[PDB]
RNA sequence: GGAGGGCAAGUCAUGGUGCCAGCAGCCGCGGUAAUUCCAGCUCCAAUA
RNA sequence: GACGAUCAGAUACCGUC
RNA sequence: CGAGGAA
RNA sequence: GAACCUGCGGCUUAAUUUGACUCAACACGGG
RNA sequence: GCACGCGCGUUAC
RNA sequence: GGUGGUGGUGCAUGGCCGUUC
RNA sequence: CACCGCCCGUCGCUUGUAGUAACGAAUGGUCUGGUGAACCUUCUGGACUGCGACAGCAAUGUUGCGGAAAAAUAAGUAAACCCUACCAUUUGGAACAACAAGAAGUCGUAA
RNA sequence: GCCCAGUGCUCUGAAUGUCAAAGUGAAGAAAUUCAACCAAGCGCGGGUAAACGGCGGGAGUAACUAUGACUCUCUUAAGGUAGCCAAAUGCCUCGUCAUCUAAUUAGUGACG
RNA sequence: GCCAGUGAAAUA
RNA sequence: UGGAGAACAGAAAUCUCCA
RNA sequence: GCUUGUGGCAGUCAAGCGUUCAUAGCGACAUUGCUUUUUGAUUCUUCGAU
RNA sequence: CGCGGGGUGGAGCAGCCUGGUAGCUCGUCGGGCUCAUAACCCGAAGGUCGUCGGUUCAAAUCCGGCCCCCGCAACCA
RNA sequence: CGCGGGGUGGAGCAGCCUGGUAGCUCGUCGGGCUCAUAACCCGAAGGUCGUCGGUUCAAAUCCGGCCCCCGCAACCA
């Protein structure tokens, strides 16, 4: 709870383990949070790294599609399909628009809708996990998929999600919790007023918990 | 002499609608496709009775071509008016120019040629001199060449062989 | 007994009673109250007068008609009189300002069923019986 | 109105009266004739219930002769 | 009206009250020639004219009355063929009246009269010889009307009339107007034509 | 630059052909609608022939001063014949005679088709 | 002086009039076929 | 008299005072 | 005209 | 309620023949 | 005869 | 002075028919 | 002519009417306080005149007596007139108002 | 007589908005500057005119004619009620008709 | 579940 | 501004040529 | 207090009224004036008494 | 005179601010309806929009200038 | 200007705090019902939700920024 105990989630919580000495292999810590919890559309992000610094952790197939040319916008990589003859029948509704825009990351496709997005395609998907975000959709979905694959930084969109990092095993305290904060930027604060907008969260590394608030 | 002279200026084609659309929105198309060039509309500087109570805008189309599509003007010269225009009888100058009335008709209608109906039966004369004083840079008064259309620009709508003399 | 008293000594009573209960008669109450003298003729049977103008009056209830009437001025009395000119052409003889002799119509009071407020008949023009002027072979001036 | 005075009489066609063929006896004579034409024994003779109207002879020339 | 006190003088330059004084109570004499118009310019010659000798304002209505009684006789003993009474004054200067109960007031127009310069010609007419006294006696009338005034003068010209110019027009027997230069003779002067003249014509232009 | 149906002249030769007998030679027959063909092929009247000639005189005698002598008729049942073009025939309708200038187009059509028989309705109340 | 009733006397298929002119003592007549108006005819009543 | 309601209208037939 | 208001 | 049909009113018209008007007028005058 | 207002009906969604 | 009249009075009328049924 | 029947009032309209009371005037009559013609009577008055005696025979004159005209007088009958009250009989008066009668006026509906 | 909307007065009233000083919280190193709540009062609600005072205006609108108890209206609390006048209030006004005069810009009696 | 997912927005 | 070409424009509302 | 427009009052000319005639009696138009109990301008005299 | 409102059948009222059509009631005149009589109803005749001009394709309609009507305002010598 | 409440048919009122449907009354317009006449009833035409944008699939509806409306508050030199 943004208090002294931050370094109790960090410093005092960095060698908890669950057995004997402390092992003999590398470490793996971070600092959990989110993306903005807005609705993955209107306003929740912009630009600027923390860091932070990471990438996947497990899988990365997100979202990118629109026309017959959006497939190759997911061929030399791996993404979801919006289909062509579906935006007039079933390419969006609940578990539909989901499918294409409901993965884990967010979305990195382009744009093309017309008079249909106030309760179907572009619509039903927003806070679900996608609704047309900033993925430099013009050359494709790879270069700006540096904001959708690796490096990172920590593009935090769709539904929660983000990253963190600072050191290895044991050598951080005030800058461990203050490294977790450092592992937060346009995700912990931003422009006009943004020093906080949530309730709680989690964190650790592999040991056991962090802040007991 | 007698070294150079005679040519067909431009084919000043113009209909005079008198509304907005989808009416002028037509005299356009019509013009445009009888044209190949596009359609320079016409203003409407100001108001009175018979409608046309609008500020300078929407009430006719201008598109007017020239040169190679020369004959493209007399492409109904002879035709449209049986190669006969304001004839008789004094000073052989029979109203250097040719009467007209509005044109148009076409939502279905069929191509032309004549048809399209009467139209802007002019785009005509006024004697001679030189070539580009309508120039740019070092501009100027044409020469002192030729006859006020008439005794000149008549004897060259007289060798498109037709009636007016 | 009945209301009336039957005493040989009570004649007076019965007498005064009759003199009293008798006022309930209009015919009585009428002549008794010198009423006849106050009418336009002053009791008289007939009256002379000057024609003030020939006016016409409308019939009443089920009848609709233009009655011929002369407004007369009685001589010594000097009253405005409504006088019905009898038979057909009659009014054609009455010239305005002539002298006329008038009499009532059936008992001085109600006018003939038809007429409205007219109580008199015209019998003479310039002292010439109307009937006389009504029949050619008689008289005319 | 007024000028509408005696409209009727003026409009009536003056018919003339049948200039007495002979005369009408005035005196005991008239009362006599009447006595004869009605109360004379030949009329009091036929039923008193079936004797004619002293003017059914409305002057009808057709029934005037049938009786006489 | 308001008498002739707003009468003959100056007291005010000349408020011709056009563009600047809008409300000129309209004129009074919208006549001017009233007579045997469309005249011959021969025919009704020898004109007698009525000159006023006194820098005054021959009022509005006044000029009217002039016309009135002018024509009255003009005709009444000589005919519609006899007159032609050229107005020849004419009535500008809109005069005004007056009416914070005495504090700075300019005039509101109040009738238009005209400035008879002492010597100027007023309501002056023109007619044939046999009309002399006719005309003359008549114009007398006016002089008696109209804040007089008076020339009742007999004339000549120029040629607004007969009019001496007598020996003149009686000399321009041959012609009418130009004359003028010497060139495009489209005033049929007689008689050949062009050829001859155009000979002599340059025949002198050449002598230079 | 306007022309006419089937050639105004071909018909004058078609109608007044070798056998210019019955007003409507079997030639003109091929041209008319079934209803008209019906009539002529059935029993057309002779009066319709003397009326014909009445227009004839009106068309020539009149100077080029384009002033035709109106021919009057009740034969509203007549079907305009080729040679009937150009003349102004007065046709009765109910009240008076109607003058109509016969154009090339009104042929094969009933002469009555132009003599308005009733004035349609204007309105107000 | 009357002839629908009271009140004696027309059941005229009479003419004119058309709620007008007018009648009517009181009932009531009259708005195109009036038994009461105007008039003819014939009737009744009292009869110098 | 003051109010509610009812009525096209209700200072009336009901209702609160 | 997509089964039709007060009636 | 819909489009036609037919009758009545209305308004037009040279003229739109006229009867009939709550069941006891209006596809009724055999219309 | 047609700006329309009624009344039997014919065909149908 | 007649004929004839899809001309007027159904409140002058026959005949017939509707309604009360 | 039978509830699409009867029917009431406000206001209006149409055609009309001058009542009862008061007041005004007219005629007549009475009361109150005065002015008061005329005449009966009264007390006067006494021209004129009759008688007797004396101045003369006589006209005339003095006086006594008697009758007696005008005048004047008081009380009285009391005409007319005025004033103060009251009665009777007639007759009069107006805009607005009022009353009378009528209706398929107007608004509603009392019975 | 009718008007409580206006101005005043005055009641427990209003579920809520201002609203000062101290008192409280937050922030700086303080000085200090931001906060939240906060009596009355205000504003909201009601009564109140033998309290100050108020008391409309135009259109149509038959049974010669002018006419309004008629309705239509636009309208502010309410739209002058009994009563009363050219009056010591009436502009035009010397109001119009009488009445008192030979005569009345006076009187009085009427009429709105 | 999810790679499928519609919809206004997908969860153990 | 005249003289030219007018189809909802045709006094013109507005369209194109020319002195 | 000037001034006199505006008020008032007289005056010339004679077209007209005055049925016959311009002036007995009056006079359009046009024009000359007097008047200082109207009114209007003006601000000289008097608010350091009217 | 200065402000502001108004003249429309024979009368009293509409139409004008929203240019193209002039309406209502009475009165005058004719007919329905009815067994008939009232009543009641229909249909006609009738306006030049005070008058003069301007915009305008078009004026009762918007705009003016005169002529009277009412209301305000007012200092004449 | 600072606080707080509000603009939705032609008028007066709803729907908004509870996103998907814009309702009522009068007025305008048509029809029922009735033997008929009132009355009474049904059905239509008509709102862009002041205006601009944002969330949103979706906005009169939640959120803003302007434009007027009312209420509080107020110290200008």
Interhelix angle for E132-144 vs E60-76, to 10°? 150
Q: What is the DSSP string of D1-68?
A: --TTTTHHHHHS--PPP---SS----SHHHHHHHHHHHSSTTTTTS-SSSPPPTTT-SS-HHHHHHH-
In order of C33, C128, E5, E101, the CA distances from E104 in angstroms are: 92, 92, 21, 9
The CA–CA distances, whole Å, from C116 to C87, D4, F58 equal: 18, 20, 84
Nucleotide nearest to E26 (CA to C1'): R65
- C-alpha dist (Å) from residue A62 to A77, B32, E149: 10, 51, 115
The nearest CA of chain B is from the CA of F89 a distance in Å of: 32
Nearest to D1 among C56, C88, C89 (CB): C56
Distance CA B59, CA B48 (A): 14
Split into its structural domains, chain F has a count of: 1
Does residue E150 sit in helix, strand or coil?
coil
Angle CA(D56)–CA(D61)–CA(D63) in degrees, nearest 5?
A: 50
Token pair for residue E81?
A: 């063929």
Q: Which nucleotide is nearest to A116 (CA to C1')?
A: S57
CATH of the domain at F57: 3.30.860.10
Are the beta carbons of A26 and A168 closer than 8 angstroms?
yes
CA distances for C63 relative to A67, C57, C60, C66, C88, angstroms: 104, 12, 6, 10, 17
Contacts C92 to D, Cβ<8 Å: 5-6
Give the closest residue to G30 (Cα–C1′). C63
Give the CA-trace dihedral at A126, A131, A135, A140, to 10 degrees. Answer: 130
Contact A173, A137 (CB under 8 A): no
Residues C93 and C27 in one domain: no
Whether the CA torsion B154, B158, B160, B163 is positive or negative: it is positive
Q: Name the DSSP letter for residue B18.
A: -
Beta bridge partners of C49: C74, C100
B40 touches strand P (CB under 7 A): yes
Distances (CA, A) of F121 to A119, F96, F116: 56, 19, 13
CA B157/CA F79 separation, integer angstroms: 48
**Radius of gyration of chain B from its Cα atoms, rounded to whole angstroms:** 18
Tell me the H-state helices in chain B.
24-35, 150-153
Kindly state whether residues C61 and C4 are assigned to the same domain: no
Per DSSP, the three-state class of E200 is helix
Q: Which of C46, C47, C131, C51 is nearest to C98 (CA)?
A: C51
Whether C67 and C111 share a structural domain: yes
Contact between E62 and E147 (Cβ < 8 Å): yes
Using the Cβ of D17 and the Cβ atoms of chain C, whether some distance falls under 8 Å is answered with no
Q: Is residue B151 part of a domain?
A: no
Is residue B82 within 8 A of residue B59, CB to CB? The reply is: no
Residue E75 to residues B30, E36, E71, E87, F76, Cα–Cα distance (Å): 73, 10, 6, 16, 71
Instruction: From A123, A145, A154, A129, select the one nearest A37 (Cα to Cα).
Output: A129
Query: Among positive and negative, which fits the CA dihedral E188, E194, E196, E200?
Result: positive
> Dmax over Cα atoms in chain A, in whole Å?
64
Calculate the dihedral angle through the C-alpha atoms of A144, A150, A155, A159, rounding to the nearest 10 degrees.
110
Residues B63, B38 contacting (CB under 8 angstroms): yes
**Three-state secondary structure string covering chain F:** CCCCCCCHHHHHHHHCCCCCCCCCCHHHHHHCCHHHHHHHHHHCCCHHHHHHHHHHHHHHHCCCCCCCCCEEECCCCCECCHHHCCCEEEEECCCCEEEEECCHHHCCCEHHHHCCCCCCCCCCC
Asked, for residue C75, whether it belongs to a domain, the answer is yes
Assigned token pair, F116: 């308005």
Task: For nucleic chain M, give residues with Cβ below 7 angstroms from it.
Answer: C 34, 37-38, 42, 55, 57-58, 78-79, 82, 116-117
Enumerate residues 6+ apart whose C-beta is below 8 A from E110: E2, E6, E25, E94, E95, E96, E97
Under CATH, to which class is E48-169 assigned?
alpha beta
Residue B83 lies in a domain: yes
Count: domains in chain C: 2
- Longest CA–CA span in chain D (Å) reads 59
Radius of gyration of chain F (CA): 16
Residues of chain F with C-beta less than 8 angstroms from the C-beta of B114: 1
The nearest CA of chain D is from the CA of C79 a distance in Å of 24
Token digits of residue A79: 């993404």
DSSP state of E190: S
What secondary structure does DSSP assign to C6-70, as a single string? --SS-HHHHHHHHHHHGGG-HHHHHHHTT-GGGSTTTT-SEEEEEEEEEEEEE--TT---EEEEE
The residues, ordered by sequence, that sit 6+ positions from E89 with a Cβ below 8 Å of its Cβ are E52, E58, E63, E114, E116, E120, E122, E123
The total of other beta-carbon atoms located within 10 Å of residue E2's CB is 10
**DSSP-based three-state secondary structure for B41:** strand
Half-sphere exposure of B37 (CA within 13 A, CB side): 18
Distance CA E83, CA E64 (A): 17
**Which chains are within 8 Å of D by 3+ CB pairs?**
C
Given a contact cutoff of 8 angstroms between Cβ atoms, the answer to whether A120 and A93 are in contact is yes
On whether residue C38 sits in a domain, the answer given is no
Q: Are F97 and F90 in contact (CB under 8 A)?
A: yes
How far, in Å, CA of E99 to CA of E7, rounded?
Answer: 19
Chain F interface includes B119 (CB < 8 A): no
User: Rounded to whole angstroms, how far apart are CA atoms C134 and C87?
Assistant: 8
- Say which residues have a Cβ less than 8 Å from residue C22's Cβ, sequence separation at least 6: C28
> Per DSSP, what are the bridge partners of residue C73?
C50, C80
In a shared domain, residues C68 and C93: yes
Between chains, do C66 and D4 touch, taking CB under 8 Å as contact?
Answer: yes
- Return the H-helix or E-strand segment holding C84: strand C80-84
**Spatial distance between the Cα atoms of D52 and D60, rounded to a whole number of angstroms:** 14
Backbone angles phi, psi at C4, to 5 degrees: -55, 145
- State phi, psi for A182 to the nearest 5 degrees: -55, -30
B49 in contact with nucleic chain R (CB within 7 A): yes
C60: nearest nucleotide, CA–C1' criterion = M102
- Cβ-contact F73, F89 below 8 angstroms: yes
- CA dist., res. F87 & res. F102, Å (int): 6
Q: Alpha-carbon distance B39 to B64, whole Å?
A: 8
Cα torsion angle, D44, D45, D48, D53, sign: negative
Cα gap F116→F125, rounded to integer Å: 25
Asked whether B and E share 3 or more beta-carbon pairs under 8 angstroms, the answer is no
Asked if residues E84 and E37 have their Cβ atoms less than 8 Å apart, the reply is yes
From chain C, the residues in CB contact with D10 under 8 A are 89
Residues in contact with A29: Cβ distance below 8 Å, sequence separation at least 6, in sequence order: A14, A165, A166, A167, A204, A205, A206
Residue F13 in any domain: the answer is yes
Q: Does B114 touch chain F (CB under 8 A)?
A: yes
Resolution in angstroms for this experimental structure?
10.6
Alpha-carbon distance of B77 to B86, in angstroms, equals 12
Cα–Cα dist E117/E122, whole Å? 10
Q: Name residue, tokens 């935090």.
A: A156
Residue ranges with strand state E in chain B = none
The CA distance from E129 to E135, in Å, is 10
Backbone angles phi, psi at E197, to 5 degrees: -50, -60
- Is-contact A84 A100, C-beta < 8 A? no
Q: Which two tokens stand for residue B29?
A: 């198309």
Neighbours of chain F (3+ CB pairs under 8 A): B
Measure CA of the first residue to CA of the last residue in chain E; give whole Å. Answer: 69
| Neighbouring residues of E174: CB distance < 8 A, sequence distance ≥ 6 | E189
> In sequence order, what are the residues at sequence separation of 6 or more whose Cβ sits closer than 8 angstroms to the Cβ of residue A72?
none
**Distance in angstroms (rounded) separating the CA atoms of residues A101 and A109:** 10
Strand C46-58 relative to strand C66-74, pairing: antiparallel
Which residues share a beta bridge with E186?
none
Residue C54 phi, psi dihedral angles, 5° rounding: -95, 120
- Phi and psi (nearest 5°) for C89? -65, -10
- List all nucleotides in chain K with at least one atom under 7 A from a protein Cβ: 1-3
- The DSSP line for A132-184 is S--S-TTT-SSSGGGGTTS--S----SSS-------SSS--SHHHHHHHHHT-
Is residue B84 included in any domain, yes or no? yes
State how far the Cα of F73 lies from the Cα of F90, in Å rounded to an integer. Answer: 6
Give the determination technique.
cryo-EM
* Chain-centroid distance, C-alpha E99: 37
C15 phi and psi angles, rounded to 5 deg: -60, -55
If asked whether residues C6 and C52 sit together in one domain, one would say no
Residue B57 corresponds to which tokens in the numbers above?
A: 């805008």
Protein residue ranges contacting nucleic strand S, Cβ under 7 Å: A 38-43, 117-120, 122-127, 131
> Does residue B120 fall inside a structural domain?
yes
Q: What's the DSSP call for residue E180?
A: -
Q: In Å, how far are B52, C89, E43, E154, E161 from E40, measured between CA atoms? A: 52, 82, 5, 20, 11
Q: Quote the distance between the C-alpha of residue F100 and its chain's center.
A: 10
Among C65, C69, C74, C72, residue whose Cα is nearest residue C42: C74
| Sequence-distant (≥ 6) Cβ neighbours of residue E189 within 8 angstroms | E174, E175
Residue E142: how many CB atoms within 10 A of its CB?
Answer: 25
Q: Does residue A98 lie within 7 Å of nucleic acid chain O, judged by its CB?
A: yes
Q: Encoding tokens for residue A105?
A: 């990351």
Domain shared by C53 and C100, yes or no: yes
Mutate to test the interface with C, among D5, D11, D14 (most CBs of C within 10 A): D5
Residues 6+ apart with CB under 8 A from C79: C40, C73
Are F105 and F5 within 8 A, CB to CB?
A: yes
Bases of chain G below 7 A from a protein C-beta are 1, 3, 9-13, 15-17, 19-31, 37-45, 47
User: Does some domain include residue C82?
Assistant: yes
- The answer to whether B109 CB is within 7 Å of strand P is no
Domain residue extents for chain E: 48-169, 174-208
Find out whether B146 and B152 touch, Cβ atoms under 8 Å.
Answer: yes
Q: CB within 8 A of E188, min separation 6: which ones?
A: none
DSSP E198: H
Measured at the CA of E168, the angle between CA E166 and CA E170, to 5 degrees, comes to 65
CA C77 to C1' M22, in angstroms, rounded, equals 25
A170 C-beta neighbours (distance < 10 Å), count:
13
**DSSP-based three-state secondary structure for C133:** helix
DSSP code at position E169: H
Burial class (CB in 10 A: 0-12, 13-18, 19+), A20: exposed
Give the residue numbers spanning the domain of F80: 8-114
* Nearest Cα residue to B98 out of B141, B160, B38: B160
Per the structure, the complete domain to which residue B17 belongs is given by 1-89+96-125
Cβ distance A44 to A60 under 8 Å?
Answer: no
Asked if the structure places residue F123 within a domain, the reply is no
Q: Domain of B31: which CATH number?
A: 3.30.1440.10
Give per-residue burial for F87-121: e unless 16+ CB within 10 Å, then b. bbbebbeeeebbebebebebbbebbbebbeeeeee
CB contact under 8 A, D6 and C92: yes
Q: Which pair of structure tokens corresponds to residue F30?
A: 């091929």
d(CA B48, CA B53): 6
The residue of chain F with its CA nearest to that of B79 is F1
Q: Which domain holds residue C114?
A: 46-134
Co-location of C14 and C74 in the same domain: no
DSSP symbols for chain A: --STTHHHHTTSSSS--SSSS--SS---------S--S-SSSSS--S---S-----SS-------SSTTSSGGGTTTT-----STTTTTTS-SSSHHHHHH-SSS--------SS--SSSSSSTTHHHH-SS--S-TTT-SSSGGGGTTS--S----SSS-------SSS--SHHHHHHHHHT-STTT--SSS-S---S-----SSSS-S---
- Which residue, chain included where needed, has tokens 């009206």? E1
Residue A89 sits at φ, ψ, to 5 deg, of -165, -55
Contact F104, F88 (CB under 8 A): no
- Contact predicate A39/A126, CB 8 Å: yes
Residue nearest to nucleotide G43 (CA to C1'): D55
In a domain, F106, yes or no: yes
Tell me whether residue B13 is in a domain.
Answer: yes
Q: Encode burial over A145-162: b for 16+ CB neighbours within 10 A, e otherwise.
A: bebbbeebbbbbbbbbbb
Nearest alpha carbon to residue C123 among C140, C93, C101, C90: C101
Listing DSSP states for E76-139 in one string gives HTT-TTT--B---S----EEEE----SS--PPEEEEE-EEE-TTEEES-----GGGHHHHHHHH
Q: Give the neighbor-by-neighbor strand order of the sheet with F88-92.
A: F71-73, F88-92, F97-101
Those residues with Cβ within 8 angstroms of residue F2's Cβ, 6 or more apart along the chain or in another chain: none
Helix, strand, coil percent values for chain E (each to nearest 5): 25, 15, 65
The beta-carbon neighbor of C91 closest among D5, D9, D10 is D5
Residue with tokens 């049938």: D66
């Amino acid at each position: 709870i943004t208090s002294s105990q931050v370094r109790e989630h960090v410093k005092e919580l960095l060698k908890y383990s669950n057995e004997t000495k402390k092992r003999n292999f590398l470490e793996t810590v971070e600092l959990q949070v989110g993306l903005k919890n807005y609705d993955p559309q209107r306003d929740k992000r912009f630009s600027g790294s923390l860091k932070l610094p990471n990438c996947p952790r497990p899988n990365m197939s997100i979202c990118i599609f629109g026309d017959a040319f959006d497939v190759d916008r997911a061929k030399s990589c791996g993404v979801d399909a919006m289909s062509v003859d579906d935006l007039k029948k079933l390419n969006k509704n609940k578990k539909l628009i989901k499918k294409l825009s409901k993965k884990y990351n967010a979305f990195i496709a382009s744009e093309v809708l017309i008079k249909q997005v106030p309760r179907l395609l572009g619509p039903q998907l927003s806070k679900a996990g996608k609704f047309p975000t900033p993925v430099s959709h013009n050359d494709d979905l790879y270069g700006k998929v540096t904001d959708v694959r690796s490096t990172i930084k920590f593009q935090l969109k769709k539904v929660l999600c983000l990253a963190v990092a600072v050191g290895n095993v044991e050598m951080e305290e005030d800058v461990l919790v203050n490294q977790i904060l450092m592992s937060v930027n346009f995700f912990v604060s931003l422009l006009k007023k943004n020093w906080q907008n949530v309730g709680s969260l989690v964190v650790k590394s592999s040991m056991g918990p962090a802040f007991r608030l | 002499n007698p070294m150079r002279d005679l040519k067909i200026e431009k084919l000043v084609l113009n209909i005079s609608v008198g509304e907005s659309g989808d009416r002028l929105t037509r005299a356009s198309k019509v013009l445009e496709q009888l044209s190949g060039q596009t359609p320079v509309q016409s203003k409407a500087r100001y108001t009175v009775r018979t409608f046309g109570i609008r500020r300078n805008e929407k009430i006719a189309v201008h598109v007017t071509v020239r040169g190679p599509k020369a004959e493209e003007i007399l492409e109904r010269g002879l035709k449209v008016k049986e190669y006969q225009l304001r004839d008789r009888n004094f000073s052989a100058t029979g109203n250097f120019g040719f009467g007209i009335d509005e044109h148009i008709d076409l939502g279905i209608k069929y191509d032309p040629s004549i048809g399209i109906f009467g139209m802007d039966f002019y785009v005509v004369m006024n004697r001679p001199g030189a070539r580009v004083t309508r120039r740019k840079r070092c501009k100027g008064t044409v020469g002192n060449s030729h006859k006020t259309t008439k005794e000149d620009t008549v004897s060259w709508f007289k060798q498109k062989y037709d009636a007016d003399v | 007994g009945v209301g009336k008293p039957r005493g040989i000594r009570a004649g007076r009573k019965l007498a005064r009673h009759r003199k009293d209960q008798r006022w309930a008669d209009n015919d009585f109450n009428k002549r008794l109250l010198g009423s006849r003298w106050r009418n336009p003729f002053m009791g008289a049977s007939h009256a002379k007068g000057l024609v003030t103008e020939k006016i016409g009056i409308e019939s009443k209830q089920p009848n609709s008609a233009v009655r011929k009437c002369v407004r007369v001025l009685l001589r010594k009395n000097s009253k405005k009189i409504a006088a019905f000119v009898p038979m057909d052409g009659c009014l054609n003889f009455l010239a305005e300002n002539d002298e006329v002799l008038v009499a009532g119509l059936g008992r001085q009071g109600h006018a003939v069923g038809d007429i409205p407020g007219v109580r008199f008949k015209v019998v003479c023009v310039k002292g010439i019986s109307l009937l006389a002027l009504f029949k050619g072979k008689k008289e005319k001036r | 109105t007024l000028a509408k005075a005696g409209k009727v009489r003026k409009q009536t066609p003056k018919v003339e009266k049948k200039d007495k063929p002979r005369k009408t006896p005035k005196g005991r004579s008239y009362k006599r004739i009447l006595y004869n034409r009605r109360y004379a024994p030949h009329i009091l003779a036929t039923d008193p219930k079936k004797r004619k109207s002293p003017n059914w002879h409305a002057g009808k020339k057709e029934k005037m002769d049938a009786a006489a | 009206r308001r008498p002739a006190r707003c009468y003959r003088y100056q007291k005010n330059k000349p408020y011709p009250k056009s563009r600047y004084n809008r409300a000129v109570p309209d004129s009074k004499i919208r006549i001017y020639d009233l007579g045997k118009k469309k005249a011959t310019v021969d025919e009704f010659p020898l004109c007698v004219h009525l000159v006023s000798n006194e820098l005054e304002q021959l009022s509005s209505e006044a000029l009217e009355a002039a016309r009135i009684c002018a024509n009255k006789y003009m005709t009444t003993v000589s005919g519609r063929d006899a007159f032609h009474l050229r107005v020849r004054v004419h009535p500008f200067h809109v005069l005004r009246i007056n009416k914070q109960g005495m504090r700075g007031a300019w005039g509101k127009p109040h009738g238009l009269a005209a400035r008879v310069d002492i010597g100027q010609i007023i309501f002056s007419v023109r007619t044939k010889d046999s009309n002399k006294d006719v005309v003359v006696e008549g114009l007398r009338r006016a002089r008696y009307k109209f804040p007089g005034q008076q020339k009742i003068i007999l004339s000549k010209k120029w040629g607004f009339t007969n009019l001496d110019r007598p020996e003149y027009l009686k000399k321009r027997e041959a012609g009418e107007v130009k004359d003028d230069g010497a060139f495009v003779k489209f005033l049929s002067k007689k008689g050949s034509l062009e050829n001859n003249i155009r000979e002599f014509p340059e025949y002198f232009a050449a002598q230079a | 630059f306007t022309f006419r149906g089937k050639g105004l002249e071909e018909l004058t030769a078609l109608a007044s052909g070798s056998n210019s007998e019955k007003l409507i030679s079997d030639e003109l027959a091929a041209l008319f609608d079934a209803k008209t063909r019906r009539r002529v092929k059935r029993g057309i009247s002779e009066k319709y022939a003397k009326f014909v000639n009445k227009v004839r005189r009106s068309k020539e005698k009149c100077p080029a001063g384009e002033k035709p002598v109106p021919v009057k008729t009740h034969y509203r049942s007549m079907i305009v014949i080729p040679e009937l073009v150009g003349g102004i025939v007065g046709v009765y309708n109910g009240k008076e005679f109607v003058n109509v200038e016969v154009k090339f187009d009104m042929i094969g059509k009933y002469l009555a088709e132009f003599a308005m028989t009733y004035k349609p309705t204007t309105h107000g109340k």
